[PDB]
Write a protein that binds this DNA or RNA. Structure first.
Ligand SMILES: [Mg+2]
Ligand SMILES: [Mg+2]
Length: 820
RNA sequence: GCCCGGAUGGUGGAAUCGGUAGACACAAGGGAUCCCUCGGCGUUCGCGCUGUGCGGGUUCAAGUCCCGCUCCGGGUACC
C-alpha cells in the first residue's frame, strides 16, 4: 500500500475500471430482484452545480447500497437537451444550438464520471437526438387519433396545440391516494393544482338584455348576501354594454398590459330569490377562462368581493354567523369561514351543508340553477414558436384539412446546421422547409416545436430500452423495471414535471405499452445547498456582493463573525446562509472542490452534513473534516495491512474488552443498515461509522486475536462506507484482501450472537431524577438491582432518613426510587 | 391569508420506543499529523445545582405526547 491517501492517484484508475468492466450495466434479468433508482436528468447548461452533485450523490449511494444487497440495479443518466438557454447562447457565441449543446454534454459527462457516479452508460440518452424524439412524434399522432389532441387559438394570443390532460383529471386526483411514499407537500400541491371544485351555476335575468347571465359559485349557502355580480372583461355582456359605454370599452382593453379595478355595465340583474335589482360590473379579477367567466359577488364573505365593493361603494351584507354564534364584524374585512345562516329568510339557522343543499334544490327546482363540477386544471399547451425542440408532426393540406404527418415521413428531423438571426426560427424564416407533399398534392408542415416538458415526461421509461427501434417502448423491458423504486429530485417541479410524467405514464398504459398505473413509488426531494453571503456598500450606495471564498472573516470570544473584509479592504456585512446565486455571488463550483479534495471527500460531506431532505449548509471547514476523516481511515488500513495476514478469528475466547468492541462493530452494522435502508438518515449513518472508527483507532493491534478482530471490523467499515466513498473503498478492499471487486461484495450483516450482552447499564432515579448509572449482570433480578443501587453512595445519600414509597422498574433499563 | 416544516450549546445538528439530553462534526483554545478540554454556574475532580422558545397539562418520569401562546424558515393563491 502507499502511505499517503492521494485521490488524484486513485479516482481515475477506479473510474476507468468501471468503464472497462462495465460494472454498472444491467440487463432484464428475471432471476434477480430488480431495483430502479432514478435521479432527475440534467439540462446540459455547461457545468454541474452543487444541486446536481447532491442530487446524484444521493441516487448513487442508494444504487450502490442496493447492489450490495443483491439486487439488480438500474441507475441511468441522460440529457434533457432541447430548450431555450442554447438559443441565446448560440447567439452570444459564434455557434448553433446543437454543437453548443453536444459540447456541454461532453463536458458535464466527464464531470459526472469524475464523481464516480455508477451509471449504466449503455443506456445514456440525449433527448435532442432523432433517435429519441421521433418517438414522441409518433406518440403525438397516435394521441391525436385517440381524440386527445386538438388545435386552438388562445392567450399567452396565438394558435396552439393541446393535449387533453383534463380527461385524466379525476384519475390523476384519485391516484394520489396510492402514493404513500410521495411527500405530502407534493401531493397537496397536485390536488390544489387540479382544483376540483363542487359548485352551483346560477342564472339571472338581466333588464335591457336579451340573454341571461350565469355565474359559478362554490358557496351557494351565501346566496342572500349577493349584492352585485362580477363579469370578466371578455364576457359577451360586458362587450355588449361597451358599444354604448365609452368608459367600459377603455376597460376591455386595459386588461391586456398586465388589486381591484372595475367598470359598471349599467345592466341590472334580478336576484331570483329576493326580486331585488342588482348591478353587474366588469371586474379585473374575474377569469374569463374558468367557470362561466362570471361570479355572484358576496362581499360580506369573499375577500376579493369585499375589496371591490368597498372601493366602489357597493353594499356589503352579512349572512353567515360568527364561529361563536354572533353576528360578525365586517368593518375590517370579509368573514371567511363556513357557518350558520342568518339574514337569509327561509334559510335562517341552516348550517353550511344543509344550506348549500337547500338553496341548490330550490334553485334547481325554480329552473335557474344546477350543481356543477369545475376544475382549475386546463389542457396542456405543447407548441412553441421556438427552433430548439422537436418538430410537431402535423400537416396542413392545401385544401385546408389538418392531419398528422404520415408514418413514412417520420421522424420529422429538425436540422442542426443553421444560422441564428436570433429572432426567427431558422425553420420559419426559410419558407422552403415548411414546404412538403402528402399523397401528391402539396402540403405545409408545422413549424412550432414541442414544449420541452414533452421529452422529460417519458425519458424514465425509455431508459428501459434505449436502443429499441420498432417502438417507443419494449413492453417486456419497460414492465420489468417499472415502476421506478425511487425518484430523486427538487420539490420545485411538483405541478409541472411531476404531474406531466404521471399523466404520460397513464397515456402509455392506455396505449398498451406498460401495465401499471403510476410511474414511481417513492419520491425523494432533496433540500437546497446554501452558502454564506457577504456584501459591502460602495461609495455610491450600491451593494456589492462578495463571494464567501473571497471573504476574510474574524471570529471572537467563541467564534462568531464580528467583522469581515475583502482583499480590496472593503467592509463586509454577513447576511447568513442563503440559496446560491449569481446576484448574491456565493455559488460554489463543484469542480474546484472535486479537484481540491477529491470526489470521495466531496460526496462524503454532501451526505453527512445534513439529512437528504433538509437544506445543506456548505462549509469549507466541514469539507476539510470529511477529508481528514478519509485520511484517518486510510492510515488505519495501512498500519493494519503493513503487518500482514491474520489468523482466523476465534469468537469463543475473546476478552470482555474484545467482546465489547466486536459488539460495537455489529451494532454499527445494524444501525447503519437501518439508517440507509429504512429511515434514509444517511447523515446519522455516516456518524455511526465515524463513531465506530474513533474506537477502532484506539484498540490494540499486537495479538493474533486483536488483529483478526481489526480485519473483520475494517472489512465491515470499508463496505459500509462504499456507497458514499466508492473510490477509496474499492482500493482498500483490495488492500485488505477481500474477495473480488467491492462493487459486488455483499452488504455486511450483523451477527446476532455478537450483539448479545453479558452486562447492562441501569439508570437509577430518585423521584425521577438520575443519581447514578450502574453496570449489573444482564440477567440480574430486580432484587439484585435494588440492592446494588442501594450500595451506591450517590444514591444512598438521597436515601438518608427518607423512605421508599414505591418503585418503578423497567427490566435492564431503569430503576426509579420514589421517596420518601 | 393557506399548506408545510422547524426552534435543543459558539455553529450544523442527534436522541427511532416517553426512561443516560446534546451523538457525530465544525469552531475553539490550549498542549508535544494525534491524544486531550469543550452546554452554563460552583467544584474538595466524587458530584452538585441548573438546562431542550415561553405558559400550562398528562405521567412515578416529557426534547419526545396533548392545549395554548411568541418567534423563524421555505413554498403558494384573483380558479
Ligand atoms: Mg437526522
Ligand atoms: Mg425518545
Amino acid at each position: 500500500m502507499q502511505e499517503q491517501y492521494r485521490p488524484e492517484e486513485i479516482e481515475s484508475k477506479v473510474q476507468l475500471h468501471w468503464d472497462e468492466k462495465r460494472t454498472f450495466e444491467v440487463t432484464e434479468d428475471e432471476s434477480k430482484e430488480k431495483y430502479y433508482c432514478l435521479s432527475m436528468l440534467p439540462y446540459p447548461s455547461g457545468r454541474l452545480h452543487m444541486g446536481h452533485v447532491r442530487n446524484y450523490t444521493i441516487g448513487d449511494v442508494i444504487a450502490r447500497y442496493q447492489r450490495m444487497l443483491g439486487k439488480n440495479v438500474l441507475q441511468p443518466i441522460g440529457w434533457d437537451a432541447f430548450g431555450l438557454p442554447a438559443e441565446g447562447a448560440a447567439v452570444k457565441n459564434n455557434t448553433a444550438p446543437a454543437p453548443w449543446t453536444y459540447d456541454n454534454i461532453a463536458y458535464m459527462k466527464n464531470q459526472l464520471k469524475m464523481l464516480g457516479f455508477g451509471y449504466d452508460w449503455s443506456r445514456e440518452l440525449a433527448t435532442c437526438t432523432p433517435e429519441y424524439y421521433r418517438w414522441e412524434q409518433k406518440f403525438f399522432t397516435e394521441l391525436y387519433k385517440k381524440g386527445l389532441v386538438y388545435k386552438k387559438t388562445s392567450a399567452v394570443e396565438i394558435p396552439q396545440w393541446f393535449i387533453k390532460i383534463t380527461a385524466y383529471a379525476d384519475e390523476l386526483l384519485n391516484d394520489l391516494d396510492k402514493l404513500d411514499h410521495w411527500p405530502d407537500t407534493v401531493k397537496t400541491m397536485q390536488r390544489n393544482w387540479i382544483g376540483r371544485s363542487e359548485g352551483v351555476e346560477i342564472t339571472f335575468n338581466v333588464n335591457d338584455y336579451d340573454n341571461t347571465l350565469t355565474v359559478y359559485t362554490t358557496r351557494p349557502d351565501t346566496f342572500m348576501g349577493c349584492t352585485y355580480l362580477a363579469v370578466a372583461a371578455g364576457h359577451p355582456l360586458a362587450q355588449k354594454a361597451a358599444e354604448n359605454n365609452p368608459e367600459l370599452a377603455a376597460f376591455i382593453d386595459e386588461c391586456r398590459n398586465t388589486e381591484k379595478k372595475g367598470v359598471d355595465t349599467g345592466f341590472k340583474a334580478v336576484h331570483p330569490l329576493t326580486g331585488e335589482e342588482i348591478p353587474v360590473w366588469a371586474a379585473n379579477f374575474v377569469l374569463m377562462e374558468y367557470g362561466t367567466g362570471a361570479v355572484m359577488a358576496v362581499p360580506g364573505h369573499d375577500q376579493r368581493d369585499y375589496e371591490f365593493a368597498s372601493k366602489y361603494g357597493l353594499n356589503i351584507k352579512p349572512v353567515i354567523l360568527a364561529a361563536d354564534g354572533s353576528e360578525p364584524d365586517l368593518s375590517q374585512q370579509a368573514l371567511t369561514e363556513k357557518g350558520v345562516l342568518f339574514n337569509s329568510g327561509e334559510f335562517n339557522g341552516l348550517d353550511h351543508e344543509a344550506a348549500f343543499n337547500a338553496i341548490a334544490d330550490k334553485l334547481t327546482a325554480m329552473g335557474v340553477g344546477e350543481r356543477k363540477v369545475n376544475y382549475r386544471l386546463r389542457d396542456w399547451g405543447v407548441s412553441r414558436q421556438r427552433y430548439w425542440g422537436a418538430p410537431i408532426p402535423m400537416v396542413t393540406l392545401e385544401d385546408g384539412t389538418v392531419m398528422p404527418t404520415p408514418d413514412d415521413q417520420l421522424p420529422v428531423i429538425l436540422p442542426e446546421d443553421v444560422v441564428m438571426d436570433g429572432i426567427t426560427s431558422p425553420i420559419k424564416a426559410d419558407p422552403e422547409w415548411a414546404k412538403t407533399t402528402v399523397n401528391g398534392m402539396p402540403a405545409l408542415r408545422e413549424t412550432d416545436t414541442f414544449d420541452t416538458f414533452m421529452e422529460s415526461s417519458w425519458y424514465y421509461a425509455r431508459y428501459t430500452c434505449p436502443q429499441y427501434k420498432e417502438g417507443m417502448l419494449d413492453s417486456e423491458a419497460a414492465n420489468y423495471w417499472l415502476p421506478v423504486d425511487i425518484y430523486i429530485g427538487g420539490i420545485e417541479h411538483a405541478i409541472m414535471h411531476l404531474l406531466y410524467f404521471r399523466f404520460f405514464h397513464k397515456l402509455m398504459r392506455d396505449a398498451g405499452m406498460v401495465n401499471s398505473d403510476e410511474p414511481a413509488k417513492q419520491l425523494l426531494c432533496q433540500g437546497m445547498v446554501l452558502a454564506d453571503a457577504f456584501y459591502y456598500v460602495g461609495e455610491n450606495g450600491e451593494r456589492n456582493w462578495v463571494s464567501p471564498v473571497d471573504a476574510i472573516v474574524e471570529r471572537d470570544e467563541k467564534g462568531r463573525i464580528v467583522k469581515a473584509k475583502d482583499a480590496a479592504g472593503h467592509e463586509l456585512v454577513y447576511t447568513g446562509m442563503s440559496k446560491m446565486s449569481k446576484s448574491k455571488n456565493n455559488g460554489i463550483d463543484p469542480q474546484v472542490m472535486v479537484e481540491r479534495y477529491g470526489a470521495d471527500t466531496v460526496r462524503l460531506f454532501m451526505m453527512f452534513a445534513s439529512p437528504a431532505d433538509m437544506t445543506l449548509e456548505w462549509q469549507e471547514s466541514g469539507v476539510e473534516g470529511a477529508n481528514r476523516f478519509l485520511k484517518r481511515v486510510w492510515k488505519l488500513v495501512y498500519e493494519h495491512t503493513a503487518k500482514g495476514d491474520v489468523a482466523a478469528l476465534n469468537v469463543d475466547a475473546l476478552t470482555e474488552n474484545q467482546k465489547a468492541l466486536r459488539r460495537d462493530v455489529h451494532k454499527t452494522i445494524a444501525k447503519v443498515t437501518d439508517d440507509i435502508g429504512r429511515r434514509q438518515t444517511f447523515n446519522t449513518a455516516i456518524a455511526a461509522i465515524m463513531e465506530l472508527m474513533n474506537k477502532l483507532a484506539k484498540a490494540p493491534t499486537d495479538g493474533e486475536q486483536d488483529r483478526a478482530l481489526m480485519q473483520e471490523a475494517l472489512l465491515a467499515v470499508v463496505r459500509m462506507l462504499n456507497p458514499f466513498t466508492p473510490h477509496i473503498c474499492f482500493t482498500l478492499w483490495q488492500e485488505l484482501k477481500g474477495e473480488g471487486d467491492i462493487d459486488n461484495a455483499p452488504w455486511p450483516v450483523a451477527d446476532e450472537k455478537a450483539m448479545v450482552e453479558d452486562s447492562t447499564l441501569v439508570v437509577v432515579q430518585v423521584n425521577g431524577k438520575v443519581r447514578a448509572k450502574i453496570t449489573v449482570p444482564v440477567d440480574a433480578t430486580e432484587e439484585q438491582v435494588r440492592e446494588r443501587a442501594g450500595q451506591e453512595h450517590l444514591v444512598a445519600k438521597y436515601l438518608d432518613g427518607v423512605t421508599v414509597r414505591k418503585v418503578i422498574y423497567v427490566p435492564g433499563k431503569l430503576l426509579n426510587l420514589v421517596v420518601g
